[PDB]
Design a binder for this molecule. Structure first.
Ligand SMILES: [Mn+2]
Ligand SMILES: [Mn+2]
Lengths: 91, 459, 27
Protein backbone atom coordinates (compact mmCIF):
# COMPACT_ATOMS: atom_id res chain seq x y z
CA UNK A 1 0.00 0.00 0.00
CA UNK A 2 2.73 2.42 0.96
CA UNK A 3 5.14 1.63 -1.91
CA UNK A 4 2.32 2.03 -4.49
CA UNK A 5 1.59 5.49 -3.06
CA UNK A 6 5.16 6.97 -3.32
CA UNK A 7 5.43 10.07 -5.58
CA UNK A 8 8.96 9.39 -7.03
CA UNK A 9 9.60 5.57 -6.87
CA UNK A 10 9.49 3.42 -10.04
CA UNK A 11 7.25 0.48 -8.98
CA UNK A 12 7.66 -1.36 -12.38
CA UNK A 13 10.51 -3.44 -10.81
CA UNK A 14 8.26 -4.56 -7.85
CA UNK A 15 8.21 -8.15 -9.28
CA UNK A 16 11.02 -9.42 -6.99
CA UNK A 17 9.75 -7.68 -3.77
CA UNK A 18 5.97 -8.15 -4.09
CA UNK A 19 4.83 -11.07 -1.91
CA UNK A 20 2.32 -13.79 -3.01
CA UNK A 21 -1.05 -14.31 -1.20
CA UNK A 22 -1.72 -17.56 0.65
CA UNK A 23 -5.36 -18.01 1.61
CA UNK A 24 -6.27 -19.66 4.95
CA UNK A 25 -9.76 -20.90 6.02
CA UNK A 26 -11.31 -21.44 9.49
CA UNK A 27 -12.14 -25.21 9.69
CA UNK A 28 -14.44 -24.68 12.70
CA UNK A 29 -16.42 -21.74 11.33
CA UNK A 30 -19.96 -22.54 9.99
CA UNK A 31 -19.53 -20.94 6.49
CA UNK A 32 -16.46 -23.13 5.67
CA UNK A 33 -18.15 -26.26 7.08
CA UNK A 34 -21.22 -25.47 4.93
CA UNK A 35 -18.94 -24.84 1.91
CA UNK A 36 -17.48 -28.40 2.19
CA UNK A 37 -21.10 -29.70 2.16
CA UNK A 38 -21.90 -27.47 -0.87
CA UNK A 39 -18.73 -28.44 -2.77
CA UNK A 40 -19.33 -32.16 -1.95
CA UNK A 41 -22.40 -32.50 -4.20
CA UNK A 42 -20.83 -30.78 -7.23
CA UNK A 43 -17.14 -29.89 -7.60
CA UNK A 44 -17.92 -27.91 -10.78
CA UNK A 45 -20.95 -26.02 -9.36
CA UNK A 46 -20.60 -22.32 -10.23
CA UNK A 47 -22.53 -21.34 -7.05
CA UNK A 48 -19.56 -22.50 -4.92
CA UNK A 49 -17.17 -20.90 -7.51
CA UNK A 50 -19.04 -17.61 -6.98
CA UNK A 51 -18.52 -17.77 -3.19
CA UNK A 52 -14.79 -18.44 -3.46
CA UNK A 53 -14.36 -15.17 -5.40
CA UNK A 54 -16.81 -13.20 -3.13
CA UNK A 55 -15.20 -14.52 0.08
CA UNK A 56 -11.76 -13.85 -1.44
CA UNK A 57 -12.74 -10.24 -2.22
CA UNK A 58 -14.22 -9.83 1.27
CA UNK A 59 -11.04 -11.30 2.81
CA UNK A 60 -8.73 -9.11 0.67
CA UNK A 61 -10.64 -6.05 1.66
CA UNK A 62 -10.15 -6.75 5.40
CA UNK A 63 -6.42 -7.53 4.88
CA UNK A 64 -5.53 -4.16 3.25
CA UNK A 65 -5.39 -5.00 -0.44
CA UNK A 66 -7.18 -2.61 -2.85
CA UNK A 67 -9.77 -4.00 -5.24
CA UNK A 68 -8.22 -3.45 -8.70
CA UNK A 69 -11.89 -3.52 -9.87
CA UNK A 70 -13.95 -2.03 -6.99
CA UNK A 71 -17.21 -1.82 -9.02
CA UNK A 72 -17.63 -5.61 -9.16
CA UNK A 73 -17.78 -5.89 -5.34
CA UNK A 74 -20.10 -2.86 -5.27
CA UNK A 75 -22.47 -4.38 -7.84
CA UNK A 76 -22.38 -7.68 -5.87
CA UNK A 77 -23.52 -5.87 -2.67
CA UNK A 78 -26.12 -3.89 -4.72
CA UNK A 79 -27.40 -7.25 -6.09
CA UNK A 80 -27.35 -8.35 -2.43
CA UNK A 81 -29.53 -5.37 -1.49
CA UNK A 82 -31.97 -6.36 -4.31
CA UNK A 83 -32.35 -9.62 -2.32
CA UNK A 84 -32.66 -7.79 1.02
CA UNK A 85 -35.43 -5.57 -0.45
CA UNK A 86 -37.22 -8.36 -2.43
CA UNK A 87 -36.67 -6.72 -5.91
CA UNK A 88 -33.98 -9.09 -7.36
CA UNK A 89 -36.09 -9.82 -10.51
CA UNK A 90 -37.36 -6.16 -10.67
CA UNK A 91 -40.97 -7.23 -9.68
CA UNK B 1 -75.99 -41.34 -13.56
CA UNK B 2 -72.75 -42.55 -15.26
CA UNK B 3 -70.51 -40.59 -12.79
CA UNK B 4 -71.39 -43.10 -10.00
CA UNK B 5 -69.96 -45.97 -12.13
CA UNK B 6 -66.80 -43.87 -12.70
CA UNK B 7 -66.67 -43.26 -8.85
CA UNK B 8 -66.92 -47.06 -8.19
CA UNK B 9 -64.21 -47.55 -10.88
CA UNK B 10 -62.18 -44.88 -8.94
CA UNK B 11 -62.41 -46.96 -5.70
CA UNK B 12 -60.81 -49.95 -7.53
CA UNK B 13 -58.48 -47.43 -9.32
CA UNK B 14 -57.03 -46.39 -5.92
CA UNK B 15 -56.38 -50.09 -5.12
CA UNK B 16 -54.84 -50.57 -8.64
CA UNK B 17 -52.78 -47.26 -8.44
CA UNK B 18 -51.26 -48.48 -5.08
CA UNK B 19 -50.46 -51.72 -7.05
CA UNK B 20 -48.92 -49.70 -10.05
CA UNK B 21 -51.77 -50.61 -12.51
CA UNK B 22 -52.03 -46.92 -13.56
CA UNK B 23 -53.46 -47.35 -17.12
CA UNK B 24 -56.79 -48.78 -15.86
CA UNK B 25 -57.01 -45.95 -13.29
CA UNK B 26 -56.32 -43.26 -15.96
CA UNK B 27 -59.04 -44.70 -18.29
CA UNK B 28 -61.53 -44.45 -15.37
CA UNK B 29 -60.26 -40.88 -14.60
CA UNK B 30 -60.99 -39.88 -18.23
CA UNK B 31 -64.52 -41.40 -18.02
CA UNK B 32 -65.15 -39.45 -14.76
CA UNK B 33 -64.10 -35.98 -16.25
CA UNK B 34 -65.94 -36.70 -19.56
CA UNK B 35 -69.07 -36.07 -17.50
CA UNK B 36 -68.11 -34.31 -14.22
CA UNK B 37 -66.14 -30.98 -13.96
CA UNK B 38 -66.55 -30.65 -10.15
CA UNK B 39 -65.28 -33.68 -8.08
CA UNK B 40 -62.41 -31.50 -6.70
CA UNK B 41 -60.87 -33.86 -4.09
CA UNK B 42 -60.73 -36.75 -6.59
CA UNK B 43 -59.40 -34.28 -9.28
CA UNK B 44 -56.58 -33.50 -7.02
CA UNK B 45 -56.03 -37.30 -6.71
CA UNK B 46 -55.87 -37.63 -10.51
CA UNK B 47 -53.51 -34.60 -10.22
CA UNK B 48 -51.29 -36.68 -7.82
CA UNK B 49 -51.55 -39.91 -9.89
CA UNK B 50 -50.65 -37.85 -12.96
CA UNK B 51 -47.60 -36.33 -11.15
CA UNK B 52 -46.45 -39.92 -10.27
CA UNK B 53 -47.03 -40.85 -13.97
CA UNK B 54 -45.32 -37.54 -15.04
CA UNK B 55 -48.61 -36.24 -16.63
CA UNK B 56 -47.72 -32.76 -15.44
CA UNK B 57 -49.99 -30.83 -17.79
CA UNK B 58 -53.28 -32.61 -16.97
CA UNK B 59 -52.79 -32.34 -13.22
CA UNK B 60 -51.61 -28.68 -13.46
CA UNK B 61 -54.68 -27.77 -15.53
CA UNK B 62 -57.02 -29.76 -13.18
CA UNK B 63 -55.69 -27.96 -10.13
CA UNK B 64 -55.75 -24.50 -11.85
CA UNK B 65 -59.39 -24.90 -13.02
CA UNK B 66 -60.51 -26.26 -9.64
CA UNK B 67 -58.75 -23.38 -7.75
CA UNK B 68 -60.23 -20.84 -10.20
CA UNK B 69 -63.75 -22.20 -9.68
CA UNK B 70 -63.00 -23.09 -6.02
CA UNK B 71 -60.67 -20.53 -4.46
CA UNK B 72 -60.87 -22.51 -1.12
CA UNK B 73 -59.44 -25.84 -2.58
CA UNK B 74 -56.29 -25.94 -0.37
CA UNK B 75 -55.35 -29.59 -1.15
CA UNK B 76 -55.53 -28.63 -4.88
CA UNK B 77 -53.09 -25.70 -4.27
CA UNK B 78 -50.81 -28.17 -2.40
CA UNK B 79 -50.95 -30.66 -5.37
CA UNK B 80 -50.31 -27.78 -7.84
CA UNK B 81 -47.26 -26.55 -5.89
CA UNK B 82 -45.92 -30.15 -5.60
CA UNK B 83 -46.31 -30.60 -9.41
CA UNK B 84 -44.59 -27.22 -10.02
CA UNK B 85 -41.67 -28.30 -7.76
CA UNK B 86 -41.41 -31.65 -9.63
CA UNK B 87 -41.36 -29.75 -12.99
CA UNK B 88 -38.59 -27.52 -11.51
CA UNK B 89 -40.66 -24.28 -11.05
CA UNK B 90 -40.06 -22.70 -7.59
CA UNK B 91 -41.76 -19.23 -7.81
CA UNK B 92 -45.15 -20.67 -8.95
CA UNK B 93 -44.99 -23.30 -6.17
CA UNK B 94 -44.31 -20.42 -3.70
CA UNK B 95 -47.40 -18.48 -4.93
CA UNK B 96 -49.52 -21.62 -4.52
CA UNK B 97 -47.94 -22.51 -1.12
CA UNK B 98 -48.49 -18.92 0.17
CA UNK B 99 -52.09 -19.23 -1.08
CA UNK B 100 -52.63 -22.67 0.66
CA UNK B 101 -51.00 -21.17 3.76
CA UNK B 102 -53.20 -17.99 3.83
CA UNK B 103 -56.46 -19.83 2.93
CA UNK B 104 -55.79 -22.61 5.53
CA UNK B 105 -52.99 -21.62 7.93
CA UNK B 106 -53.80 -24.56 10.25
CA UNK B 107 -52.12 -27.33 8.14
CA UNK B 108 -48.42 -27.39 9.22
CA UNK B 109 -47.54 -29.79 6.32
CA UNK B 110 -48.27 -27.02 3.77
CA UNK B 111 -46.52 -24.44 6.05
CA UNK B 112 -43.24 -26.39 6.57
CA UNK B 113 -43.07 -27.17 2.81
CA UNK B 114 -43.66 -23.48 1.93
CA UNK B 115 -40.75 -22.37 4.15
CA UNK B 116 -38.45 -25.19 2.90
CA UNK B 117 -39.16 -24.05 -0.70
CA UNK B 118 -38.59 -20.38 0.35
CA UNK B 119 -35.18 -21.45 1.82
CA UNK B 120 -34.35 -23.32 -1.44
CA UNK B 121 -35.33 -20.16 -3.44
CA UNK B 122 -32.90 -18.06 -1.28
CA UNK B 123 -30.04 -20.13 -2.80
CA UNK B 124 -31.11 -19.42 -6.45
CA UNK B 125 -31.73 -15.74 -5.58
CA UNK B 126 -28.25 -15.46 -3.97
CA UNK B 127 -26.74 -17.26 -7.04
CA UNK B 128 -28.33 -14.63 -9.37
CA UNK B 129 -26.92 -11.86 -7.11
CA UNK B 130 -23.32 -13.23 -6.79
CA UNK B 131 -22.49 -14.69 -10.28
CA UNK B 132 -20.57 -13.32 -13.34
CA UNK B 133 -18.78 -14.61 -16.51
CA UNK B 134 -15.73 -16.85 -15.76
CA UNK B 135 -12.98 -15.03 -17.75
CA UNK B 136 -10.84 -11.83 -17.62
CA UNK B 137 -12.63 -9.34 -19.96
CA UNK B 138 -9.53 -7.75 -21.63
CA UNK B 139 -9.52 -8.02 -25.53
CA UNK B 140 -13.37 -7.49 -25.78
CA UNK B 141 -12.33 -3.81 -25.32
CA UNK B 142 -11.00 -4.09 -28.98
CA UNK B 143 -14.70 -4.19 -30.07
CA UNK B 144 -15.38 -1.09 -27.95
CA UNK B 145 -12.31 0.79 -29.34
CA UNK B 146 -13.34 0.09 -32.97
CA UNK B 147 -17.01 0.83 -32.35
CA UNK B 148 -15.74 4.19 -30.99
CA UNK B 149 -13.90 4.91 -34.35
CA UNK B 150 -11.00 7.01 -32.90
CA UNK B 151 -9.86 7.31 -36.52
CA UNK B 152 -11.51 5.28 -39.34
CA UNK B 153 -9.18 4.97 -42.42
CA UNK B 154 -5.67 5.72 -43.67
CA UNK B 155 -3.53 6.65 -46.75
CA UNK B 156 -2.64 2.96 -47.59
CA UNK B 157 -5.57 0.58 -46.71
CA UNK B 158 -9.31 0.87 -47.58
CA UNK B 159 -10.49 -2.01 -45.34
CA UNK B 160 -14.06 -3.41 -45.35
CA UNK B 161 -16.01 -4.10 -42.07
CA UNK B 162 -15.21 -7.86 -42.49
CA UNK B 163 -14.06 -10.15 -45.37
CA UNK B 164 -11.58 -7.58 -46.78
CA UNK B 165 -11.41 -7.92 -50.62
CA UNK B 166 -8.55 -9.92 -52.25
CA UNK B 167 -7.63 -6.63 -54.03
CA UNK B 168 -7.28 -4.90 -50.59
CA UNK B 169 -5.28 -7.89 -49.22
CA UNK B 170 -3.08 -7.42 -52.35
CA UNK B 171 -2.84 -3.63 -51.63
CA UNK B 172 -1.88 -4.32 -47.98
CA UNK B 173 0.97 -6.62 -49.10
CA UNK B 174 2.18 -4.09 -51.74
CA UNK B 175 2.63 -1.24 -49.19
CA UNK B 176 4.35 -3.75 -46.88
CA UNK B 177 6.84 -3.56 -49.81
CA UNK B 178 6.59 0.26 -49.25
CA UNK B 179 6.87 -0.55 -45.44
CA UNK B 180 3.71 1.29 -44.25
CA UNK B 181 1.29 0.12 -41.45
CA UNK B 182 -2.48 -0.25 -40.91
CA UNK B 183 -4.41 2.34 -38.86
CA UNK B 184 -4.88 1.08 -35.24
CA UNK B 185 -8.73 0.79 -35.50
CA UNK B 186 -8.56 -1.12 -38.83
CA UNK B 187 -5.76 -3.41 -37.54
CA UNK B 188 -8.03 -4.09 -34.50
CA UNK B 189 -11.08 -4.52 -36.84
CA UNK B 190 -9.47 -7.43 -38.71
CA UNK B 191 -7.78 -8.83 -35.55
CA UNK B 192 -10.96 -9.12 -33.41
CA UNK B 193 -12.84 -10.68 -36.38
CA UNK B 194 -9.92 -13.13 -36.93
CA UNK B 195 -9.99 -13.94 -33.18
CA UNK B 196 -13.76 -14.60 -33.26
CA UNK B 197 -13.42 -16.87 -36.31
CA UNK B 198 -10.44 -18.77 -34.76
CA UNK B 199 -12.38 -19.10 -31.45
CA UNK B 200 -15.35 -20.73 -33.33
CA UNK B 201 -13.20 -22.96 -35.65
CA UNK B 202 -12.80 -26.69 -34.73
CA UNK B 203 -11.23 -27.22 -31.22
CA UNK B 204 -8.42 -29.16 -32.88
CA UNK B 205 -8.33 -29.58 -36.65
CA UNK B 206 -8.69 -32.84 -38.60
CA UNK B 207 -9.36 -32.67 -42.38
CA UNK B 208 -9.78 -35.07 -45.33
CA UNK B 209 -7.70 -33.34 -48.09
CA UNK B 210 -9.17 -33.53 -51.67
CA UNK B 211 -7.60 -35.14 -54.75
CA UNK B 212 -6.50 -32.57 -57.44
CA UNK B 213 -5.32 -29.83 -55.02
CA UNK B 214 -1.54 -29.11 -54.65
CA UNK B 215 0.19 -28.54 -51.25
CA UNK B 216 2.01 -25.33 -50.44
CA UNK B 217 3.85 -25.63 -47.11
CA UNK B 218 5.94 -23.19 -45.15
CA UNK B 219 7.99 -24.53 -42.32
CA UNK B 220 9.55 -21.77 -40.24
CA UNK B 221 9.49 -18.41 -42.06
CA UNK B 222 10.69 -15.95 -39.38
CA UNK B 223 8.86 -12.88 -40.75
CA UNK B 224 10.44 -11.07 -43.76
CA UNK B 225 8.70 -9.18 -46.65
CA UNK B 226 11.01 -10.59 -49.36
CA UNK B 227 10.08 -14.09 -48.11
CA UNK B 228 6.40 -13.21 -48.78
CA UNK B 229 7.31 -11.92 -52.27
CA UNK B 230 9.47 -15.03 -52.90
CA UNK B 231 6.68 -17.49 -51.95
CA UNK B 232 4.51 -15.59 -54.51
CA UNK B 233 7.35 -16.50 -56.99
CA UNK B 234 7.55 -20.13 -55.72
CA UNK B 235 3.79 -20.71 -56.23
CA UNK B 236 0.67 -18.96 -57.47
CA UNK B 237 -1.78 -17.26 -55.03
CA UNK B 238 -3.42 -19.42 -52.23
CA UNK B 239 -6.77 -17.93 -53.39
CA UNK B 240 -9.15 -20.78 -52.25
CA UNK B 241 -7.41 -22.66 -55.13
CA UNK B 242 -4.44 -24.48 -53.47
CA UNK B 243 -4.18 -25.90 -49.84
CA UNK B 244 -1.85 -23.55 -48.02
CA UNK B 245 -0.36 -24.71 -44.76
CA UNK B 246 1.76 -22.35 -42.68
CA UNK B 247 3.41 -24.70 -40.19
CA UNK B 248 6.07 -22.40 -38.87
CA UNK B 249 7.70 -19.93 -36.68
CA UNK B 250 6.58 -16.62 -38.33
CA UNK B 251 6.45 -13.79 -35.69
CA UNK B 252 9.94 -13.57 -34.46
CA UNK B 253 13.59 -13.06 -35.66
CA UNK B 254 12.73 -10.61 -38.46
CA UNK B 255 11.80 -6.87 -38.50
CA UNK B 256 8.62 -7.39 -40.60
CA UNK B 257 7.19 -10.07 -38.28
CA UNK B 258 3.85 -8.50 -37.14
CA UNK B 259 3.24 -7.66 -40.80
CA UNK B 260 3.54 -11.32 -41.90
CA UNK B 261 0.75 -12.41 -39.47
CA UNK B 262 -1.37 -9.30 -40.28
CA UNK B 263 -1.63 -10.36 -43.98
CA UNK B 264 -1.74 -14.14 -43.26
CA UNK B 265 -4.62 -13.66 -40.78
CA UNK B 266 -6.45 -11.67 -43.48
CA UNK B 267 -5.95 -14.56 -45.93
CA UNK B 268 -7.24 -17.05 -43.28
CA UNK B 269 -10.52 -15.02 -42.97
CA UNK B 270 -10.94 -14.98 -46.78
CA UNK B 271 -9.75 -18.56 -47.50
CA UNK B 272 -10.93 -20.54 -44.36
CA UNK B 273 -11.55 -24.11 -45.61
CA UNK B 274 -8.00 -25.16 -46.76
CA UNK B 275 -5.70 -22.38 -45.39
CA UNK B 276 -4.24 -23.72 -42.09
CA UNK B 277 -1.89 -21.74 -39.89
CA UNK B 278 -0.24 -23.77 -37.11
CA UNK B 279 1.60 -22.61 -33.96
CA UNK B 280 5.32 -22.49 -34.08
CA UNK B 281 6.90 -22.75 -30.67
CA UNK B 282 8.18 -19.19 -31.57
CA UNK B 283 4.67 -17.79 -31.79
CA UNK B 284 4.22 -18.51 -28.01
CA UNK B 285 4.27 -15.54 -25.35
CA UNK B 286 7.88 -15.82 -23.94
CA UNK B 287 9.46 -16.05 -27.46
CA UNK B 288 8.48 -12.39 -27.96
CA UNK B 289 10.39 -11.33 -24.83
CA UNK B 290 13.60 -13.26 -25.66
CA UNK B 291 13.72 -12.04 -29.33
CA UNK B 292 12.27 -8.59 -28.42
CA UNK B 293 9.03 -8.79 -30.55
CA UNK B 294 7.03 -7.82 -27.42
CA UNK B 295 8.88 -4.44 -27.34
CA UNK B 296 9.11 -4.22 -31.17
CA UNK B 297 5.28 -4.30 -31.32
CA UNK B 298 5.12 -1.90 -28.27
CA UNK B 299 7.08 0.74 -30.28
CA UNK B 300 5.11 0.11 -33.57
CA UNK B 301 1.75 0.16 -31.70
CA UNK B 302 0.69 0.66 -28.03
CA UNK B 303 0.94 -2.45 -25.81
CA UNK B 304 -2.69 -3.72 -26.12
CA UNK B 305 -1.98 -4.72 -29.78
CA UNK B 306 0.79 -7.08 -28.57
CA UNK B 307 -1.57 -8.47 -25.90
CA UNK B 308 -4.10 -9.25 -28.66
CA UNK B 309 -1.36 -10.93 -30.75
CA UNK B 310 -0.32 -12.97 -27.65
CA UNK B 311 -3.99 -13.97 -27.11
CA UNK B 312 -4.36 -14.93 -30.81
CA UNK B 313 -1.15 -17.02 -30.43
CA UNK B 314 -3.13 -19.12 -27.87
CA UNK B 315 -6.17 -19.23 -30.23
CA UNK B 316 -3.93 -20.50 -33.11
CA UNK B 317 -4.19 -24.25 -34.22
CA UNK B 318 -1.72 -26.56 -32.45
CA UNK B 319 -1.40 -29.58 -34.84
CA UNK B 320 -3.45 -31.18 -37.66
CA UNK B 321 -3.77 -34.18 -40.01
CA UNK B 322 -3.93 -34.07 -43.83
CA UNK B 323 -6.01 -36.88 -45.44
CA UNK B 324 -5.39 -39.09 -42.32
CA UNK B 325 -2.03 -39.90 -44.11
CA UNK B 326 0.29 -36.99 -43.04
CA UNK B 327 0.67 -35.15 -39.74
CA UNK B 328 1.34 -31.44 -40.28
CA UNK B 329 3.12 -30.45 -37.20
CA UNK B 330 5.64 -28.15 -35.77
CA UNK B 331 7.68 -30.97 -34.06
CA UNK B 332 6.05 -34.36 -33.12
CA UNK B 333 3.37 -36.07 -30.93
CA UNK B 334 3.94 -35.98 -27.11
CA UNK B 335 4.93 -38.85 -24.73
CA UNK B 336 3.95 -42.49 -25.70
CA UNK B 337 2.92 -43.86 -29.14
CA UNK B 338 -0.85 -43.88 -28.30
CA UNK B 339 -1.43 -40.07 -28.55
CA UNK B 340 -3.70 -38.84 -31.38
CA UNK B 341 -5.05 -35.37 -32.25
CA UNK B 342 -8.34 -36.91 -30.88
CA UNK B 343 -6.58 -37.22 -27.47
CA UNK B 344 -5.08 -33.68 -27.76
CA UNK B 345 -8.42 -32.06 -28.95
CA UNK B 346 -9.98 -32.61 -25.49
CA UNK B 347 -7.62 -29.82 -24.28
CA UNK B 348 -8.99 -26.49 -25.59
CA UNK B 349 -7.01 -23.87 -27.56
CA UNK B 350 -6.80 -21.27 -24.74
CA UNK B 351 -3.70 -22.63 -22.92
CA UNK B 352 0.06 -23.45 -22.80
CA UNK B 353 1.70 -26.20 -20.55
CA UNK B 354 5.31 -25.87 -19.23
CA UNK B 355 8.09 -25.43 -21.85
CA UNK B 356 8.93 -29.15 -21.57
CA UNK B 357 5.20 -30.10 -21.09
CA UNK B 358 2.55 -31.65 -23.39
CA UNK B 359 1.76 -28.96 -26.06
CA UNK B 360 5.41 -27.72 -25.95
CA UNK B 361 6.52 -31.39 -26.26
CA UNK B 362 4.48 -31.32 -29.52
CA UNK B 363 5.91 -27.99 -30.73
CA UNK B 364 9.54 -28.85 -30.06
CA UNK B 365 10.08 -32.63 -29.67
CA UNK B 366 13.15 -33.06 -31.87
CA UNK B 367 14.02 -35.88 -34.33
CA UNK B 368 16.64 -38.57 -34.17
CA UNK B 369 17.68 -41.19 -36.76
CA UNK B 370 18.20 -43.04 -33.42
CA UNK B 371 15.03 -45.10 -33.59
CA UNK B 372 13.83 -44.89 -29.93
CA UNK B 373 12.43 -42.01 -27.91
CA UNK B 374 15.07 -39.89 -26.16
CA UNK B 375 15.47 -36.50 -24.37
CA UNK B 376 17.17 -33.44 -25.88
CA UNK B 377 19.67 -30.68 -24.87
CA UNK B 378 17.87 -27.75 -26.66
CA UNK B 379 15.45 -27.25 -23.70
CA UNK B 380 12.15 -29.23 -24.27
CA UNK B 381 14.00 -32.41 -23.07
CA UNK B 382 12.43 -34.60 -25.82
CA UNK B 383 13.50 -36.22 -29.13
CA UNK B 384 11.85 -39.14 -30.99
CA UNK B 385 12.88 -41.42 -33.88
CA UNK B 386 11.94 -43.91 -36.66
CA UNK B 387 10.71 -46.88 -34.55
CA UNK B 388 8.47 -44.64 -32.37
CA UNK B 389 7.32 -42.55 -35.37
CA UNK B 390 6.37 -45.76 -37.28
CA UNK B 391 4.42 -46.82 -34.16
CA UNK B 392 2.59 -43.41 -34.21
CA UNK B 393 1.84 -43.86 -37.96
CA UNK B 394 0.20 -47.25 -37.21
CA UNK B 395 -1.58 -46.13 -33.99
CA UNK B 396 -2.91 -42.99 -35.73
CA UNK B 397 -3.26 -44.69 -39.22
CA UNK B 398 -0.96 -42.10 -40.98
CA UNK B 399 1.74 -42.83 -43.64
CA UNK B 400 4.31 -40.02 -42.96
CA UNK B 401 5.07 -36.87 -40.85
CA UNK B 402 6.14 -33.37 -41.94
CA UNK B 403 8.31 -31.24 -39.62
CA UNK B 404 9.32 -27.61 -39.95
CA UNK B 405 11.28 -26.36 -36.87
CA UNK B 406 14.80 -27.55 -37.73
CA UNK B 407 17.19 -25.01 -39.32
CA UNK B 408 19.40 -26.57 -42.06
CA UNK B 409 22.80 -25.76 -43.59
CA UNK B 410 20.99 -26.74 -46.85
CA UNK B 411 17.33 -27.05 -47.77
CA UNK B 412 15.11 -29.95 -46.59
CA UNK B 413 15.58 -33.36 -44.93
CA UNK B 414 14.87 -36.87 -46.14
CA UNK B 415 15.85 -39.22 -43.28
CA UNK B 416 15.28 -42.94 -42.37
CA UNK B 417 14.02 -43.67 -45.93
CA UNK B 418 11.78 -40.55 -46.31
CA UNK B 419 9.00 -41.71 -43.90
CA UNK B 420 9.72 -38.45 -42.09
CA UNK B 421 9.91 -35.21 -44.10
CA UNK B 422 11.58 -31.89 -43.10
CA UNK B 423 10.88 -28.48 -44.72
CA UNK B 424 12.60 -25.23 -43.64
CA UNK B 425 11.51 -21.93 -45.10
CA UNK B 426 13.64 -19.10 -43.56
CA UNK B 427 16.72 -18.66 -45.87
CA UNK B 428 18.11 -15.92 -43.62
CA UNK B 429 17.35 -16.12 -39.87
CA UNK B 430 19.44 -12.94 -39.33
CA UNK B 431 23.03 -11.85 -40.36
CA UNK B 432 24.32 -14.61 -37.96
CA UNK B 433 22.66 -17.28 -40.18
CA UNK B 434 22.19 -17.35 -44.01
CA UNK B 435 21.67 -20.76 -45.72
CA UNK B 436 19.48 -22.59 -48.35
CA UNK B 437 15.69 -23.07 -47.89
CA UNK B 438 13.33 -25.72 -49.06
CA UNK B 439 9.77 -25.78 -50.21
CA UNK B 440 7.69 -28.84 -51.06
CA UNK B 441 5.25 -29.64 -53.79
CA UNK B 442 2.92 -32.52 -52.84
CA UNK B 443 -0.56 -33.35 -54.26
CA UNK B 444 -3.74 -34.30 -52.38
CA UNK B 445 -4.56 -37.48 -54.41
CA UNK B 446 -1.08 -39.11 -54.56
CA UNK B 447 1.29 -38.76 -51.58
CA UNK B 448 5.13 -38.85 -51.41
CA UNK B 449 7.41 -35.88 -50.40
CA UNK B 450 8.85 -33.95 -53.43
CA UNK B 451 11.14 -30.94 -53.06
CA UNK B 452 11.78 -27.40 -54.24
CA UNK B 453 14.92 -25.40 -53.50
CA UNK B 454 15.11 -21.69 -52.77
CA UNK B 455 18.40 -19.87 -53.22
CA UNK B 456 18.76 -16.31 -51.88
CA UNK B 457 17.05 -13.41 -50.01
CA UNK B 458 17.71 -9.60 -50.23
CA UNK B 459 17.08 -6.89 -47.58
CA UNK C 1 -16.07 2.93 -4.74
CA UNK C 2 -14.97 6.56 -4.08
CA UNK C 3 -11.43 5.73 -2.84
CA UNK C 4 -12.12 6.10 0.89
CA UNK C 5 -10.94 3.35 3.25
CA UNK C 6 -13.21 2.12 6.07
CA UNK C 7 -12.63 3.06 9.73
CA UNK C 8 -13.05 -0.65 10.64
CA UNK C 9 -12.93 -3.04 7.61
CA UNK C 10 -13.69 -5.92 9.98
CA UNK C 11 -17.22 -4.65 10.89
CA UNK C 12 -18.08 -4.14 7.18
CA UNK C 13 -17.07 -7.80 6.72
CA UNK C 14 -19.07 -8.92 9.80
CA UNK C 15 -22.15 -7.12 8.31
CA UNK C 16 -21.44 -8.76 4.90
CA UNK C 17 -21.16 -12.15 6.72
CA UNK C 18 -24.49 -11.43 8.56
CA UNK C 19 -25.84 -11.19 5.01
CA UNK C 20 -23.84 -14.21 3.68
CA UNK C 21 -25.29 -16.41 6.47
CA UNK C 22 -28.67 -15.67 4.83
CA UNK C 23 -26.95 -16.42 1.47
CA UNK C 24 -25.85 -19.87 2.83
CA UNK C 25 -28.98 -20.55 5.01
CA UNK C 26 -26.75 -21.11 8.12
CA UNK C 27 -28.64 -19.16 10.84
MN1 LIG D 1 12.26 -21.43 -35.94
MN1 LIG E 1 10.38 -23.26 -33.80
Amino acid sequence: RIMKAQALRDNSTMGYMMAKKHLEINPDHPIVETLRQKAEADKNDKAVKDLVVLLFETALLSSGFSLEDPQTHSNRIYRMIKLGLGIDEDE
Amino acid sequence: GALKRAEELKTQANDYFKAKDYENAIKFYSQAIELNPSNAIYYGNRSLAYLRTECYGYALGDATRAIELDKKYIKGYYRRAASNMALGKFRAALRDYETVVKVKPHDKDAKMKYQECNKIVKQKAFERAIAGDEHKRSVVDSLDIESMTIEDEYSGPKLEDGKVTISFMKELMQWYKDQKKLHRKCAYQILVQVKEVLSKLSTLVETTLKETEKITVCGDTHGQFYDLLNIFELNGLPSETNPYIFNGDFVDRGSFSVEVILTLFGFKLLYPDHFHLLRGNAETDNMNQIYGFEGEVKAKYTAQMYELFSEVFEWLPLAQCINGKVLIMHGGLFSEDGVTLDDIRKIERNRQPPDSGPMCDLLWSDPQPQNGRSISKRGVSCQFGPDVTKAFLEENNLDYIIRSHEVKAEGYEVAHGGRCVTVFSAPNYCDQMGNKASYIHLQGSDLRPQFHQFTAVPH
